[PDB]
Write a protein that holds these residues in place. Sequence first.
Motif, PDB file in Angstrom:
ATOM      1  N   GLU B 121      56.251  26.942  45.071  1.00 12.08           N
ATOM      2  CA  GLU B 121      54.925  26.342  44.818  1.00 12.08           C
ATOM      3  C   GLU B 121      53.936  27.357  44.312  1.00 12.08           C
ATOM      4  OE1 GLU B 121      56.253  25.098  47.845  1.00 12.08           O
ATOM      5  OE2 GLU B 121      57.108  23.267  46.908  1.00 12.08           O
ATOM      6  N   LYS B 122      54.491  28.426  43.787  1.00 11.64           N
ATOM      7  CA  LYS B 122      53.705  29.444  43.187  1.00 11.64           C
ATOM      8  C   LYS B 122      52.614  29.993  44.104  1.00 11.64           C
ATOM      9  CE  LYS B 122      54.656  28.123  38.485  1.00 11.64           C
ATOM     10  NZ  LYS B 122      54.039  27.281  37.404  1.00 11.64           N
ATOM     11  N   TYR B 123      52.954  30.147  45.385  1.00 13.91           N
ATOM     12  CA  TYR B 123      52.058  30.701  46.357  1.00 13.91           C
ATOM     13  C   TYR B 123      50.708  29.973  46.436  1.00 13.91           C
ATOM     14  CZ  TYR B 123      55.583  34.327  46.037  1.00 13.91           C
ATOM     15  OH  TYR B 123      56.840  34.996  46.079  1.00 13.91           O
ATOM     16  N   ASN B 124      50.766  28.645  46.365  1.00 15.19           N
ATOM     17  CA  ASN B 124      49.601  27.774  46.392  1.00 15.19           C
ATOM     18  C   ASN B 124      48.766  28.134  47.586  1.00 15.19           C
ATOM     19  OD1 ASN B 124      48.785  24.616  47.499  1.00 15.19           O
ATOM     20  ND2 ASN B 124      48.356  25.174  45.323  1.00 15.19           N
ATOM     21  N   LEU B 125      47.457  28.177  47.360  1.00  9.35           N
ATOM     22  CA  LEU B 125      46.503  28.500  48.417  1.00  9.35           C
ATOM     23  C   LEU B 125      46.113  27.283  49.143  1.00  9.35           C
ATOM     24  CD1 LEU B 125      44.691  30.485  49.888  1.00  9.35           C
ATOM     25  CD2 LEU B 125      42.916  30.047  48.125  1.00  9.35           C
ATOM     26  N   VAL B 126      46.274  27.317  50.447  1.00 13.31           N
ATOM     27  CA  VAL B 126      45.859  26.214  51.260  1.00 13.31           C
ATOM     28  C   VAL B 126      44.836  26.841  52.171  1.00 13.31           C
ATOM     29  CG1 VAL B 126      46.497  24.426  52.901  1.00 13.31           C
ATOM     30  CG2 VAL B 126      48.184  25.167  51.219  1.00 13.31           C
ATOM     31  N   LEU B 127      43.568  26.465  51.942  1.00  6.47           N
ATOM     32  CA  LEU B 127      42.338  27.117  52.513  1.00  6.47           C
ATOM     33  C   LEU B 127      41.557  26.095  53.331  1.00  6.47           C
ATOM     34  CD1 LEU B 127      40.800  29.907  52.287  1.00  6.47           C
ATOM     35  CD2 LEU B 127      39.432  28.869  50.535  1.00  6.47           C
ATOM     36  N   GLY B 128      41.278  26.428  54.588  1.00  6.75           N
ATOM     37  CA  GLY B 128      40.385  25.626  55.424  1.00  6.75           C
ATOM     38  C   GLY B 128      38.917  25.880  55.108  1.00  6.75           C
ATOM     39  N   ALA B 129      38.053  25.234  55.846  1.00  7.80           N
ATOM     40  CA  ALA B 129      36.602  25.341  55.636  1.00  7.80           C
ATOM     41  C   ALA B 129      36.046  26.742  55.846  1.00  7.80           C
ATOM     42  CB  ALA B 129      35.874  24.375  56.520  1.00  7.80           C
ATOM     43  N   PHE B 130      35.064  27.020  55.020  1.00  4.01           N
ATOM     44  CA  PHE B 130      34.200  28.155  55.175  1.00  4.01           C
ATOM     45  C   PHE B 130      33.508  28.055  56.510  1.00  4.01           C
ATOM     46  CE2 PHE B 130      30.009  30.138  54.542  1.00  4.01           C
ATOM     47  CZ  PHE B 130      30.465  31.398  54.266  1.00  4.01           C
ATOM     48  N   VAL B 131      33.739  29.014  57.400  1.00  2.45           N
ATOM     49  CA  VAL B 131      33.046  29.045  58.690  1.00  2.45           C
ATOM     50  C   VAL B 131      31.597  29.596  58.593  1.00  2.45           C
ATOM     51  CG1 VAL B 131      33.159  29.947  61.054  1.00  2.45           C
ATOM     52  CG2 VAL B 131      35.219  29.390  59.854  1.00  2.45           C
ATOM     53  N   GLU B 132      31.477  30.825  58.091  1.00  2.00           N
ATOM     54  CA  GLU B 132      30.242  31.617  58.073  1.00  2.00           C
ATOM     55  C   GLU B 132      30.552  32.874  57.267  1.00  2.00           C
ATOM     56  OE1 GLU B 132      29.326  33.901  61.788  1.00  2.00           O
ATOM     57  OE2 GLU B 132      31.447  33.536  62.272  1.00  2.00           O
ATOM     58  N   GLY B 133      29.535  33.688  57.020  1.00  2.00           N
ATOM     59  CA  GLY B 133      29.756  34.919  56.304  1.00  2.00           C
ATOM     60  C   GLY B 133      28.598  35.272  55.410  1.00  2.00           C
ATOM     61  N   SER B 134      28.114  36.501  55.560  1.00  2.00           N
ATOM     62  CA  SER B 134      26.987  37.025  54.807  1.00  2.00           C
ATOM     63  C   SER B 134      27.327  37.232  53.307  1.00  2.00           C
ATOM     64  CB  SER B 134      26.556  38.343  55.451  1.00  2.00           C
ATOM     65  OG  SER B 134      27.702  39.189  55.598  1.00  2.00           O
ATOM     66  N   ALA B 135      28.630  37.258  52.941  1.00  2.00           N
ATOM     67  CA  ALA B 135      29.067  37.317  51.536  1.00  2.00           C
ATOM     68  C   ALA B 135      28.978  36.014  50.817  1.00  2.00           C
ATOM     69  CB  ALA B 135      30.488  37.826  51.408  1.00  2.00           C
ATOM     70  N   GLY B 136      28.779  34.943  51.566  1.00  2.00           N
ATOM     71  CA  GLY B 136      28.732  33.596  50.965  1.00  2.00           C
ATOM     72  C   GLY B 136      30.151  33.173  50.656  1.00  2.00           C
ATOM     73  N   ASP B 137      30.307  31.916  50.249  1.00  2.00           N
ATOM     74  CA  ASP B 137      31.636  31.321  50.014  1.00  2.00           C
ATOM     75  C   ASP B 137      32.036  31.424  48.565  1.00  2.00           C
ATOM     76  OD1 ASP B 137      34.083  29.934  49.986  1.00  2.00           O
ATOM     77  OD2 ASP B 137      33.159  28.083  50.685  1.00  2.00           O
ATOM     78  N   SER B 138      32.995  32.283  48.282  1.00  2.00           N
ATOM     79  CA  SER B 138      33.468  32.387  46.934  1.00  2.00           C
ATOM     80  C   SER B 138      34.982  32.221  46.951  1.00  2.00           C
ATOM     81  CB  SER B 138      32.986  33.690  46.263  1.00  2.00           C
ATOM     82  OG  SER B 138      31.562  33.642  46.092  1.00  2.00           O
ATOM     83  N   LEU B 139      35.494  31.410  47.883  1.00  2.00           N
ATOM     84  CA  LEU B 139      36.914  31.101  47.849  1.00  2.00           C
ATOM     85  C   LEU B 139      37.349  29.620  47.931  1.00  2.00           C
ATOM     86  CD1 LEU B 139      39.452  32.980  47.558  1.00  2.00           C
ATOM     87  CD2 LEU B 139      39.528  32.877  50.087  1.00  2.00           C
ATOM     88  N   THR B 140      36.488  28.735  48.411  1.00  2.00           N
ATOM     89  CA  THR B 140      36.749  27.274  48.402  1.00  2.00           C
ATOM     90  C   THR B 140      36.993  26.712  46.977  1.00  2.00           C
ATOM     91  OG1 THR B 140      35.518  27.026  50.465  1.00  2.00           O
ATOM     92  CG2 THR B 140      35.962  25.050  49.276  1.00  2.00           C
ATOM     93  N   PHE B 141      36.276  27.268  45.999  1.00  2.00           N
ATOM     94  CA  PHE B 141      36.541  27.011  44.577  1.00  2.00           C
ATOM     95  C   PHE B 141      38.017  27.177  44.185  1.00  2.00           C
ATOM     96  CE2 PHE B 141      36.798  28.442  40.204  1.00  2.00           C
ATOM     97  CZ  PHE B 141      36.023  27.511  39.530  1.00  2.00           C
ATOM     98  N   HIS B 142      38.673  28.162  44.786  1.00  2.00           N
ATOM     99  CA  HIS B 142      40.039  28.470  44.469  1.00  2.00           C
ATOM    100  C   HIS B 142      41.092  27.688  45.335  1.00  2.00           C
ATOM    101  CE1 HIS B 142      39.189  31.709  41.721  1.00  2.00           C
ATOM    102  NE2 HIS B 142      38.142  31.957  42.486  1.00  2.00           N
ATOM    103  N   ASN B 143      40.646  26.784  46.194  1.00  2.00           N
ATOM    104  CA  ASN B 143      41.554  26.043  47.046  1.00  2.00           C
ATOM    105  C   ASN B 143      42.553  25.297  46.217  1.00  2.00           C
ATOM    106  OD1 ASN B 143      41.703  23.099  48.942  1.00  2.00           O
ATOM    107  ND2 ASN B 143      42.663  24.967  49.509  1.00  2.00           N
ATOM    108  N   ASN B 144      43.813  25.294  46.604  1.00  2.00           N
ATOM    109  CA  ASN B 144      44.869  24.488  45.945  1.00  2.00           C
ATOM    110  C   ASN B 144      45.221  24.944  44.541  1.00  2.00           C
ATOM    111  OD1 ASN B 144      46.849  22.350  46.048  1.00  2.00           O
ATOM    112  ND2 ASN B 144      45.363  20.995  44.979  1.00  2.00           N
ATOM    113  N   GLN B 145      45.043  26.220  44.270  1.00  2.00           N
ATOM    114  CA  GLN B 145      45.438  26.747  42.995  1.00  2.00           C
ATOM    115  C   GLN B 145      46.684  27.591  43.197  1.00  2.00           C
ATOM    116  OE1 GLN B 145      42.737  24.613  41.503  1.00  2.00           O
ATOM    117  NE2 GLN B 145      44.075  25.836  40.232  1.00  2.00           N
ATOM    118  N   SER B 146      47.562  27.578  42.234  1.00  2.76           N
ATOM    119  CA  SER B 146      48.574  28.576  42.138  1.00  2.76           C
ATOM    120  C   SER B 146      48.032  29.979  41.962  1.00  2.76           C
ATOM    121  CB  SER B 146      49.471  28.257  40.980  1.00  2.76           C
ATOM    122  OG  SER B 146      49.980  26.930  41.050  1.00  2.76           O
TER     123      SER B 146
END
Lengths: 212, 216, 212
Positions: B121-146
Amino acid sequence: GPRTCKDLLDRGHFLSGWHTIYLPDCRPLTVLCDMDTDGGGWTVFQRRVDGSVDFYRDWATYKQGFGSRLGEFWLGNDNIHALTAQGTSELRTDLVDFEDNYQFAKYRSFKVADEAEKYNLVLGAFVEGSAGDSLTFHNNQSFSTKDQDNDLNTGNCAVMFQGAWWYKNCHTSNLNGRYLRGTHGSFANGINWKSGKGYNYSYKVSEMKVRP
Amino acid sequence: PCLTGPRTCKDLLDRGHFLSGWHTIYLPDCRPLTVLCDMDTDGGGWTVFQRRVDGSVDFYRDWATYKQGFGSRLGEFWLGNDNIHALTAQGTSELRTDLVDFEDNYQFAKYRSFKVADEAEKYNLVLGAFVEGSAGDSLTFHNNQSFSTKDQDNDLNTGNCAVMFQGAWWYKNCHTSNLNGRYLRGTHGSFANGINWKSGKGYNYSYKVSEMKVRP
Amino acid sequence: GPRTCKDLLDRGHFLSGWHTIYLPDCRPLTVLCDMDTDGGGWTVFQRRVDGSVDFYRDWATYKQGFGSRLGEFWLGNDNIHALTAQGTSELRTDLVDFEDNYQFAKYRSFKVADEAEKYNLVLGAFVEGSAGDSLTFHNNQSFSTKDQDNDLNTGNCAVMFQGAWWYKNCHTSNLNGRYLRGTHGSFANGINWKSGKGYNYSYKVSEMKVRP
Ligand SMILES: *[C@@H]1O[C@H](CO[C@@H]2O[C@@H](C)[C@@H](O)[C@@H](O)[C@@H]2O)[C@@H](O[C@@H]2O[C@H](CO)[C@@H](O[C@H]3O[C@H](CO)[C@@H](O)[C@H](O)[C@@H]3O)[C@H](O)[C@H]2NC(C)=O)[C@H](O)[C@H]1NC(C)=O
Ligand SMILES: *[C@@H]1O[C@H](CO)[C@@H](O)[C@H](O)[C@H]1NC(C)=O
Ligand SMILES: C[N+](C)(C)CCOP(=O)(O)O
Ligand SMILES: [Ca+2]
Ligand SMILES: [Ca+2]
Ligand SMILES: [Ca+2]
Ligand SMILES: [Ca+2]
């Protein structure tokens, strides 16, 4: 099984690095051996190098140790006690400033009492050092963290000086202070050693280490 | 041997290993793997699978290299997509991202779960919800991508994201984070091709330190 | 049991790092594996990276090895002999300058003899490399240090160029020289490779490494 970094050196481990030794009870501990400085065989229990690790920590964190084998760490007060408990070992503090000048200070003996008796610095004579003596002051004193007021001050030194040490009223050295990076406007709150570069200079490198 | 030993960095912490460092753990198939444990951050027990620290290792690499892992236990590394899959395949490990800029500002992002699928599955990303973080969320965009590399484009761009942005990642069209991008040392004129985290320091700032790590 | 870094690679150790291998006689040795460069599986016996370690050392220190697994080291002439005695290790030399430009040199075969033959260099043909060949000149010479002059000079090459090497009269490479940090007026006494950046440029990174 090797007791100390000195035993490892005598067994032909000539490179500095992390090795497992056995404390008197036969609990294994992976420690950093300095096989180069002053004949080698030193066990390093404190290391500052680049400010990547926060040393402004609480009692329980100083008790168990913290940091990283890839750089800065405090080995932990329980481990340091166990290492220095029966018999005695030389203490050696190595310091490196921003201009790369070496100072050091070597005490004949060193230990700290177990948690029940705080980490009371039981420490022998100053033998020699370009740094001068800045620990004997703290002899027969509890260790203190920001959340543990064993210091004899009206207030709290650890908070006043952003570190942890055998604080009395209050400090002449502060090697677990903030990594301020040289001379620093504020007072008494960096990686300081009074007789060395004073209360307003925070060293680049600090290492505290022991040997039989 | 396998059955007595730790299966995660979290087990090592629970056994009294309080210093961060490289330790051998046993994967679910009993394969030993030497992994970097972070015992120091946010309670400790994290297994670090990516680390950037000084630009000494080239991260612009091909599919087979990302698959097996590369770099050095001394410094910078990618643990390998097969290892990351095996570490995350069976249940619920959370993901922490730690970033340090050249001014000693520490930012992070934390996600509730993180799983990468297998090579098929080409190392598909399976990502849960953003909890918190001072860096902000820059990974939910990439959810479910190879996962994509320069020599294997599995992105949703009509071009080659990995080439355009000089990295390897779960690119979509293309990115909001790029932590395997080039070690550009802070501010760069080139676009989106550094160790970037959009919501953090933006598309024109490459962090000094990047670490991606997981815990149960 | 793994006999070389190449065996570790073939067993699925893809990250560079310190691993223990078993020498021809079954002595364990913890060595630095480079699992990236030019296919990986190299055993690194020399590493310079930052000038933190003194390489101006005596014969006994070079014999046993010195430095640190966290940084710079010489693995030790006895170990290098034992690693290279049984057959044909290739040699690779990796150099990085202060602009992060990489150069390298590769030789077909490389071994050093035992202490009785003064760790004589036995070097096969140059195969390739951007740094050019600055080691063949040194073929078939004893190793020398400041305190044991086995060189072809009326004087002391190790002292004149502040290093330890297979000096003749005196050198075309000096990778155990002083960490002078880029270009330097002083002649031939840095981490120098003549055909590479010359006698007046001291590299940022030097690594010497071997593979079957
Ligand atoms: C992950 O994305 C899938 C689409 O992306 C692709 O599959 C990835 C694993 C990867 O290979 C990527 O690069 C591919 O392009 C999503 O699949 C789609 O999911 C849709 C529903 O959300 C589905 O739709 C339909 O909607 C209704 C259902 O009742 C119907 O009317 C309609 O006909 C469709 O059936 C769509 O068909 C499906 N597409 C494909 C190509 O499979 C997937 O859901 C997404 N997963 C998650 C968790 O978000
Ligand atoms: C190497 O030098 C020695 C003397 O030091 C000489 O006898 C010999 O012929 C040389 N050997 C080779 C193989 O070139
Ligand atoms: C330790 N020393 C001062 C006695 C002997 C010299 O060793 P080296 O530092 O010359 O290699
Ligand atoms: Ca008080
Ligand atoms: Ca594409
Ligand atoms: Ca002599
Ligand atoms: Ca001579």
